[PDB]
Amino acid sequence: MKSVITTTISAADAAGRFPSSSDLESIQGNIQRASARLEAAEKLSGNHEAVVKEAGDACFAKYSYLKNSGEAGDSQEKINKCYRDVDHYMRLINYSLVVGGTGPLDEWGIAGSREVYRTLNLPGSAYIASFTFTRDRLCVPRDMSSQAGVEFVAALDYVINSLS
Amino acid sequence: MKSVITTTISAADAAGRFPSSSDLESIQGNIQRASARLEAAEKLSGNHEAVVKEAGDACFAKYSYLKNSGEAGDSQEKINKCYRDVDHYMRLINYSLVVGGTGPLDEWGIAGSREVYRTLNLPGSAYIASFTFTRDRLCVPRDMSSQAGVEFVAALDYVINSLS
Amino acid sequence: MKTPITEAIASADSQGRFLSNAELQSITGRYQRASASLEAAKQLTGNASRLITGAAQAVYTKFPFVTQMPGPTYASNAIGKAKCARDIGYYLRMTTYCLVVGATGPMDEYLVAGLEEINRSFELSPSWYIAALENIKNDHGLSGQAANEANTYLDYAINVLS
Amino acid sequence: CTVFAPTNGALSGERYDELLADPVAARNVVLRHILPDQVLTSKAIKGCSFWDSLPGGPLPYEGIGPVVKIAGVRLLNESSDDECDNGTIHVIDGIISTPLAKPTPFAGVFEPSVPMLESRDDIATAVYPPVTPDVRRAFGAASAPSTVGGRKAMGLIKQLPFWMYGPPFNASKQEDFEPIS
Amino acid sequence: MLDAFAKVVAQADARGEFLSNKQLNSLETMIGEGNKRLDIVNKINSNASTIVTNSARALFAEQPQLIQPGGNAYTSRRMAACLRDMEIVLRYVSYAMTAGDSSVLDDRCLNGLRETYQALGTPGTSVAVAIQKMKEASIALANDLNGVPLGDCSSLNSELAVYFDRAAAAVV
Amino acid sequence: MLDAFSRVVVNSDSKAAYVGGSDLQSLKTFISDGNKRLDAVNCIVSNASCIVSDAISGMICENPGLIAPGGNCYTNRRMAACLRDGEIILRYVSYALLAGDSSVLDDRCLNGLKETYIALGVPTASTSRAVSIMKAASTAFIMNTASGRKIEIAAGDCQALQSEAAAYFDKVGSAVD
Amino acid sequence: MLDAFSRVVVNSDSKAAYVGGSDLQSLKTFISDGNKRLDAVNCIVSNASCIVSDAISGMICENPGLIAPGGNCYTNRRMAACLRDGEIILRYVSYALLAGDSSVLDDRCLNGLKETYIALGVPTASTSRAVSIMKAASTAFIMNTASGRKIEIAAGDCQALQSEAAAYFDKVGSAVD
Amino acid sequence: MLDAFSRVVVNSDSKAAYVGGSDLQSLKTFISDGNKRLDAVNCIVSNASCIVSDAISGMICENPGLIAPGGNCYTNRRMAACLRDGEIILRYVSYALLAGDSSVLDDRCLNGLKETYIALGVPTASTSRAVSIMKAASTAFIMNTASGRKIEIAAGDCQALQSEAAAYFDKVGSAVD
Ligand SMILES: *[C@@H](C)[C@H]1/C(=C/C2=NC(=C\c3[nH]c(C[C@H]4NC(=O)C(C=C)=C4C)c(C)c3CCC(=O)O)/C(CCC(=O)O)=C2C)NC(=O)[C@@H]1C
Ligand SMILES: *[C@H](C)[C@H]1/C(=C/C2=NC(=C\c3[nH]c(C[C@H]4NC(=O)C(C=C)=C4C)c(C)c3CCC(=O)O)/C(CCC(=O)O)=C2C)NC(=O)[C@@H]1C
Ligand SMILES: C=CC1=C(C)[C@@H](Cc2[nH]c(/C=C3N=C(/C=C4\NC(=O)[C@H](C)[C@H]4CC)C(C)=C\3CCC(=O)O)c(CCC(=O)O)c2C)NC1=O
Ligand SMILES: C=CC1=C(C)[C@@H](Cc2[nH]c(/C=C3N=C(/C=C4\NC(=O)[C@H](C)[C@H]4CC)C(C)=C\3CCC(=O)O)c(CCC(=O)O)c2C)NC1=O
Ligand SMILES: C=CC1=C(C)[C@@H](Cc2[nH]c(/C=C3N=C(/C=C4\NC(=O)[C@H](C)[C@H]4CC)C(C)=C\3CCC(=O)O)c(CCC(=O)O)c2C)NC1=O
Ligand SMILES: C=CC1=C(C)[C@@H](Cc2[nH]c(/C=C3N=C(/C=C4\NC(=O)[C@H](C)[C@H]4CC)C(C)=C\3CCC(=O)O)c(CCC(=O)O)c2C)NC1=O
Ligand SMILES: C=CC1=C(C)[C@@H](Cc2[nH]c(/C=C3N=C(/C=C4\NC(=O)[C@H](C)[C@H]4CC)C(C)=C\3CCC(=O)O)c(CCC(=O)O)c2C)NC1=O
Ligand SMILES: C=CC1=C(C)[C@@H](Cc2[nH]c(/C=C3N=C(/C=C4\NC(=O)[C@H](C)[C@H]4CC)C(C)=C\3CCC(=O)O)c(CCC(=O)O)c2C)NC1=O
Ligand SMILES: C=CC1=C(C)[C@@H](Cc2[nH]c(/C=C3N=C(/C=C4\NC(=O)[C@H](C)[C@H]4CC)C(C)=C\3CCC(=O)O)c(CCC(=O)O)c2C)NC1=O
Ligand SMILES: C=CC1=C(C)[C@@H](Cc2[nH]c(/C=C3N=C(/C=C4\NC(=O)[C@H](C)[C@H]4CC)C(C)=C\3CCC(=O)O)c(CCC(=O)O)c2C)NC1=O
Ligand SMILES: C=CC1=C(C)[C@@H](Cc2[nH]c(/C=C3N=C(/C=C4\NC(=O)[C@H](C)[C@H]4CC)C(C)=C\3CCC(=O)O)c(CCC(=O)O)c2C)NC1=O
Ligand SMILES: CCC1=C(C)[C@@H](CC2=N/C(=C\c3[nH]c(C[C@@H]4NC(=O)C(C)=C4CC)c(C)c3CCC(=O)O)C(CCC(=O)O)=C2C)NC1=O
Ligand SMILES: CCC1=C(C)[C@@H](CC2=N/C(=C\c3[nH]c(C[C@@H]4NC(=O)C(C)=C4CC)c(C)c3CCC(=O)O)C(CCC(=O)O)=C2C)NC1=O
Ligand SMILES: CCC1=C(C)[C@@H](CC2=N/C(=C\c3[nH]c(C[C@@H]4NC(=O)C(C)=C4CC)c(C)c3CCC(=O)O)C(CCC(=O)O)=C2C)NC1=O
């Protein structure tokens, strides 16, 4: 699970040395950017339900054909799997946002996704519609602090650029 | 006009000495802060007309009674003088903002303002309503980066504390 | 001789083509810098004798053994002083020729070509001459672009000698 | 009409002086922004399709709740919907470009602020260069030859660390070359 | 071989477009800079032999290695080859100062020179010290207020310095 | 593989002295301009596949003989590797934006690529076209002047940073030609 | 009393318009040339005591009738007031170098001076000669070309400043005549 | 009345010595810049009636109290006089452009102006506004940047000369105030 401290410990471990001052500066930067990350994590755990609700609502506001032909989530159950999947996604954005690297988001969500969305006839463009709605909606000084909003946007963009 | 240059030259002239290193450090500070303030002046000359509109419209949005009777705002023409005097004050904020001391805004706007405003039944509270509206409409991190905005705040503060 | 015009024509002649716009622009620019060059040539021609005399006095004050050293090559004889002002006069005349031509042609074909064998075979040190050209560079008394011209060609002779 | 009006901050720039320089391009842009025959509120957009009745070509709009994008350009819902008794003027983030009026490419536009920068190994010095000091000592050596100027000739000898004056190296100092030594 | 103009035209043809008026304004600006350019090239071409000689004197004074027996510089032959190489580098830096592009220097002098000075056993860093000294002498010489009408020339000194820095960077 | 710090040190090592005041002053201006470099790299990284997609698609649409049978973009496999190549070039340019010196880009990817594209039969003018499109796109994202994305940041001037990034892309584009 | 700043502001005030983008551009040149201005006035100030002595002694040497009986430098007192006036002229010129505008020199010293020296009998020709000597001496110190003093300053072109200082001295010498 | 030549001569006679090199050098520059001076004064003795018309008309339109009753441009007679005075001011400025020294302008026109306009009751600020409009119009004509008139001339930089002409108009406008 990739973070600042796991990269530097794993790198010095691959080296075969005790941690020099470089790793110490890296973890110093971890404890500098920490406050903005954890603020974003607090607000995400605050309103996750309304975020996922707006995400799925806009995702079917864009693409109506998922419902139209039994070739997508046309049964209330499949749309419940839809909002569940976006729940998983915001949960992984919260986890990578706490860790501060893209580690848990990559290994739990992104790694091996392509076989799953490919095999199970799941379109990625609809996911991207959901995330880009939750991305376009955000205001930096309206709710989140500027530094935390940046962190949030960055992580969500990572999800988009890892998806398609 | 009170600036850094005029105060140190005038003070050394009253001293009866050559300008020593102290005045030199003063003008050193002037050429340090110069860029931040001048960015403010450029942006002020950018959108001053909308500052006229929102300033005066908020000024009568607070006090409606000026448009009610004959007293100070009987006609549309006196309202044109209202917007006009607001643009005078913004032009003096541009001037003192360029000079960097409060010189031209003091000797052109503030000096003798009280006999005029007291004589012609002009209330200061509507001016203060306008200027407090302008400082409430400060777009810092998107329009006036940081310190340009700070210099603008300081000058307009001096305007209100001169009038009130 | 190496004039700018003859470089232009010689290059186009070796290519066998005509004298297209490149070389014509070259001759234009020569015709513009030519005026300052001609003024400089006029004033060097004007005060030649005092430049030569002054230069020989500077060489004699810088190297005082030369008038004292008994020999053929040194300026102890009256003959030696005549050869002294003779040679300084040569350098001044070749500088005026290069000012008139506009390139270093006459100095490179009348003076620079073969100067080493002469300064060796008669044991004439390059440095004595350098001091002469420095006094000419100081005392020509031109001003402006004319002074830049004469200082250019005199400096050029200095960098030939070393 | 629905009047798609860009903000002041978005309007100004180099392409702005291009449009003030040309009547043709300016006319085509102003006709590109304005729709005829419809009055549209912010919440009546609703979907992703095209608009025909225009000069340039069909306009792509993506309408989702508020996150409205017009040609890929978002509109600002702070000042989007205004009554104008005949239409409504919606304000846009950017400039909608025609296929008619095409902007100049990057090589026609761009110049670097910092020169020679594809030729310098060190980015740190080139972007923030220090001032060059005096040059009197160095010019005294670069000017005249070695017999002309006497003592200065060494001039260019700068200062080595103390060990390099040492006996395995035996460096020289400028006081050695002078007559005073 | 490419100057400023040939580089602009060559890129404009590598994309196949014309020159915009922005490009043409840039060219006009560089032309107005061109008199100052010719002045710096004139100063270099004038004092060049004293530059090479004085810079070699400072080199042998600060590094007394090469003049001693078994030194790369050593022998009459080897000393003359040393001086001549410095004259070569100074000549092409005068050329790239005129062209405005660093192409002629790379094409005629720098590119492939490292393979030679490796192939002879010549210490590269000593050559780099030599070129740093000609940069100091040349830059200082270029900043002389004698004989020229006075004017602002920091950009041209910066560029000239970039050329010498490229020479010392290509030997080392 | 050298940053601004290492480059100064290497230069002061050939000079064989300590770092000194002038060099440290310029390096202090580097560190004070550090967060602009941070936000810059964040911009190019969070528009990566966007830049590569538009750039190579523009390269095909400008010169449509690449997708014609016989061109080097004629198969899915060739198009995938070409797309991948564009992503890798943008990747090491992003590293040169972090490090401040092009030592990582010169030593890693720029070295040997011209001769590889010669050995493959890749047309070099088309690659320099792709690099140029990534240059204009990348400077447009780095200055927040994209026509599809305008995110909010603190105001400031980064003309110097933009000239630096344009210097790296012109280094790659000049390096393949 | 007006600096360069207030000169731009007063000129903009007369036309009842905002400062704008070109006047500020000329004032940006004032700011960027700031340290050279500082160092120049430092050069004028550091040697100011030396300049007045030399100029007045040169004024007497050019014109020996000053020291002659019933001349205005005859009595010891008169030589003292003479030295003081040279010092005050130098003083205001240095202020005009700091300000960048000659409002200080025109208002505080220059205005009503010809009629004063006429009313006192002071020879105008002699004063303008002394102002000319301070002019040449001041430009020589400001360009670091003085014989008795050659101090190190990092190099650059100071041509704009020298013409400025020469303009103030020519204003004084043209004012006494 | 003194030109540049008589200025050199007068300065050298104050010094009480021969003419020498350096003064003559500056005067050589005067001669080589002679034709630009010629063409500049020709540009101001060209559309000059146009200048005075536009400037006084601009002075009345900027300040409408002149044409108001009991203003100094009210009566037709008074308008004739103001136009005549605008003409004369531009005339002596043109003389100062030919001479190259402001001796003619100072002695013939400038000396009695402040007292005279006070003795007539002429508002001085309005006059200085009209001198400013003549200044800007004259510099635009002298730089070939007039909108209604663009006459082709052998090209060259002429900034020196523009600043010279602006120096004389500023001398007049500062003289009336
Ligand atoms: C003409 C006046 C001179 C010339 C002056 C230059 N000075 C340059 C730079 C520079 N000068 C100072 C000293 C100045 N600044 C101050 O704050 C004070 C006193 C409080 C003084 C007296 C500084 C600090 C600097 C910059 C930093 C540094 O050099 O370490 C300079 C370089 C160009 C520029 O910075 O604009 C020049 C040209 N130089 C000349 O050759 C003539 C003789
Ligand atoms: C895109 C603008 C080109 C083109 C690209 C193609 N590249 C192909 C092969 C290939 N490319 C590279 C360079 C790349 N590999 C790396 O490791 C790095 C940097 C670390 C880079 C920049 C290599 C080494 C190779 C050979 C190995 C491989 O096949 O991946 C390629 C396949 C060519 C073929 O098999 O015929 C293509 C098509 N496509 C184009 O249309 C333009 C010219
Ligand atoms: C840890 C993270 C994590 C995720 C992110 C999900 C991702 C995920 N989704 C599905 C599976 C699914 N996901 C969806 C969701 C969709 N319905 C649509 O209309 C939209 C396109 C989309 C919501 C936006 C649907 C409908 C299925 C079932 C697909 C099917 O069986 O046809 C599956 C296969 C197993 C299953 O059936 O549940 C997986 C792994 N699971 C995880 O473990
Ligand atoms: C954890 C992270 C996190 C966020 C980033 C926000 C994002 C967010 N914003 C809103 C909701 C909102 N957000 C805004 C903000 C805007 N007003 C405008 O003029 C601008 C376009 C923009 C500020 C830049 C507004 C106005 C609403 C209410 C919209 C409405 O009800 O019409 C909602 C729906 C719930 C609500 O009403 O609060 C959510 C999830 N919430 C979160 O939990
Ligand atoms: C240089 C700066 C500068 C200013 C700031 C103004 C200030 C100013 N305003 C007025 C004069 C006036 N100012 C106003 C303005 C007002 N109308 C109202 O309803 C509001 C209370 C208020 C606008 C917010 C009015 C109405 C008059 C005329 C008052 C009257 O004649 O009754 C006067 C007297 C001269 C005149 O009548 O114009 C002055 C000096 N003038 C200047 O020279
Ligand atoms: C075309 C260019 C050109 C020159 C530059 C001269 C160079 C020159 N000088 C001499 C010859 C000479 N040159 C000098 C001059 C010197 N006397 C001294 O005291 C000083 C060291 C020095 C003057 C600075 C003397 C004295 C001789 C005669 C030497 C002798 O016979 O001993 C000779 C041999 C022929 C002769 O005797 O004249 C030549 C070729 N001749 C040329 O044709
Ligand atoms: C067109 C461009 C061009 C160059 C740049 C040179 C480069 C060059 N130098 C040498 C050759 C040489 N170059 C030097 C120079 C050096 N002496 C030292 O003490 C220093 C390390 C260094 C000067 C800074 C020496 C000494 C030799 C001879 C080496 C030897 O024979 O041992 C040679 C081999 C041929 C020869 O012997 O001359 C070449 C090609 N030649 C060219 O044609
Ligand atoms: C054929 C060869 C050749 C040259 C060598 C130049 C030499 C030269 N330079 C200038 C002119 C000039 N040269 C410079 C250059 C300088 N700026 C400074 O700060 C430094 C002292 C110096 C650069 C090192 C400047 C500034 C001018 C303009 C001077 C002025 O107008 O004040 C002029 C007058 C014409 C003009 O304005 O361009 C000439 C002839 N011209 C030529 O035709
Ligand atoms: C770990 C990741 C990380 C980042 C991504 C940055 C992001 C970041 N940038 C700034 C701060 C800044 N960032 C910029 C950058 C900009 N200049 C412009 O012209 C463009 C819009 C933009 C470059 C594309 C500027 C100018 C500032 C300073 C803003 C100001 O002080 O006005 C700050 C505030 C602290 C500071 O002043 O440095 C932060 C946190 N910092 C981090 O720690
Ligand atoms: C008897 C009447 C009389 C005149 C009216 C002038 C006309 C005149 N001007 C120039 C020549 C010139 N005139 C100008 C003048 C300027 N160029 C600019 O771009 C500016 C707009 C303008 C500022 C004044 C310039 C720059 C030259 C060329 C440079 C020069 O010759 O000094 C020449 C040189 C010959 C030629 O060009 O053919 C002549 C004769 N001389 C006279 O004898
Ligand atoms: C040689 C130089 C020279 C001058 C500069 C003028 C200056 C001057 N003007 C006037 C006289 C005058 N000047 C003006 C001009 C003015 N009208 C206004 O509205 C403005 C304030 C101003 C123009 C800007 C007017 C109106 C008169 C006549 C005044 C009167 O009779 O009331 C007079 C008195 C004689 C006369 O009536 O003509 C003089 C000496 N005359 C000269 O010989
Ligand atoms: C029909 C075949 C075709 C394409 C594919 C495009 C490709 C393309 N993009 C460009 C250039 C370009 N592309 C982008 C990136 C892009 N824009 C954004 O706002 C976002 C979010 C992006 C990624 C999704 C930017 C930012 C620019 C710079 C121009 C601009 O300001 O938009 C340019 C101009 C190149 C130049 O200036 O030389 C081209 C040709 N053009 C075509 O003809
Ligand atoms: C016998 C009666 C007498 C004098 C008294 C002097 C006075 C004098 N000083 C001059 C000019 C002059 N004076 C100085 C200042 C002076 N020089 C220095 O190097 C130091 C340290 C100084 C103060 C101690 C300088 C720097 C100059 C400029 C000339 C120069 O480069 O030295 C000039 C030339 C004026 C001109 O150029 O128009 C004169 C006349 N001359 C006389 O005939
Ligand atoms: C409504 C009341 C009124 C006027 C009257 C004008 C008067 C006027 N002329 C100006 C300035 C001005 N005037 C002219 C002269 C003029 N233009 C020509 O091309 C020809 C042939 C002329 C004489 C017929 C020139 C050349 C300029 C300079 C601007 C320009 O380039 O046109 C300026 C600008 C002043 C400044 O820059 O400070 C003004 C105010 N303006 C007004 O508001």
Side-chain angles (χ1 to χ4, degrees), chain E residues 129-151:
Chain E
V129 175
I131 297 170
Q132 291 297 109
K133 290 180 184 293
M134 291 184 293
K135 181 175 81 178
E136 291 183 17
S138 62
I139 285 186
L141 191 166
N143 216 345
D144 186 12
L145 288 184
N146 191 10
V148 186
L150 296 93

Side-chain angles (χ1 to χ4, degrees), chain G residues 92-156:
Chain G
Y92 281 102
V93 173
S94 66
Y95 291 167
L97 278 179
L98 279 170
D101 190 73
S102 59
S103 289
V104 50
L105 195 143
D106 287 329
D107 296 332
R108 314 289 191 86
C109 176
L110 180 149
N111 192 5
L113 167 75
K114 182 178 321 167
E115 291 227 336
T116 299
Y117 277 166
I118 278 166
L120 300 177
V122 172
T124 170
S126 194
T127 58
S128 65
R129 179 60 186 168
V131 170
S132 68
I133 299 169
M134 288 193 267
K135 179 173 104 207
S138 163
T139 52
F141 277 112
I142 210 159
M143 273 300 167
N144 199 6
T145 62
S147 178
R149 178 59 48 79
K150 193 168 208 101
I151 294 169
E152 59 83 32
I153 312 177

Side-chain angles (χ1 to χ4, degrees), chain D:
Chain D
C1 288
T2 62
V3 180
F4 285 157
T7 68
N8 299 117
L11 275 163
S12 67
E14 286 202 333
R15 184 172 169 75
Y16 191 72
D17 285 331
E18 289 173 350
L19 295 178
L20 295 181
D22 293 337
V24 179
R27 184 171 178 279
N28 296 318
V29 176
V30 166
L31 285 178
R32 188 68 169 85
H33 277 275
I34 297 165
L35 279 175
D37 296 331
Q38 290 159 30
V39 175
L40 294 173
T41 62
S42 63
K43 289 156 191 155
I45 301 167
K46 292 166 180 177
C48 302
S49 69
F50 290 107
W51 278 334
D52 284 329
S53 74
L54 279 169
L59 194 278
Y61 70 95
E62 294 174 348
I64 304 194
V67 193
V68 174
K69 290 177 68 60
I70 298 164
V73 189
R74 194 173 184 279
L75 64 88
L76 295 172
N77 289 319
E78 289 152 2
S79 64
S80 64
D81 200 355
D82 51 353
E83 62 168 338
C84 296
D85 301 329
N86 292 318
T88 291
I89 307 165
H90 299 285
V91 180
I92 278 174
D93 287 326
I95 320 293
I96 299 169
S97 290
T98 69
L100 198 31
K102 292 194 178 69
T104 60
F106 189 74
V109 176
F110 181 76
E111 55 193 339
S113 68
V114 186
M116 278 297 139
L117 211 34
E118 291 176 313
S119 166
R120 271 177 152 191
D121 332 317
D122 38 328
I123 300 309
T125 288
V127 177
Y128 301 99
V131 51
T132 59
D134 302 69
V135 296
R136 154 175 290 84
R137 212 168 78 84
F139 177 70
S143 181
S146 176
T147 60
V148 192
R151 333 203 183 204
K152 301 194 171 191
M154 299 300 68
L156 274 288
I157 286 156
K158 312 154 281 143
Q159 199 188 15
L160 308 168
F162 62 106
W163 53 261
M164 201 163 213
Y165 299 104
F169 295 97
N170 281 319
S172 60
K173 304 189 182 203
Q174 286 183 4
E175 298 160 2
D176 294 334
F177 301 94
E178 295 175 349
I180 169 50
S181 167

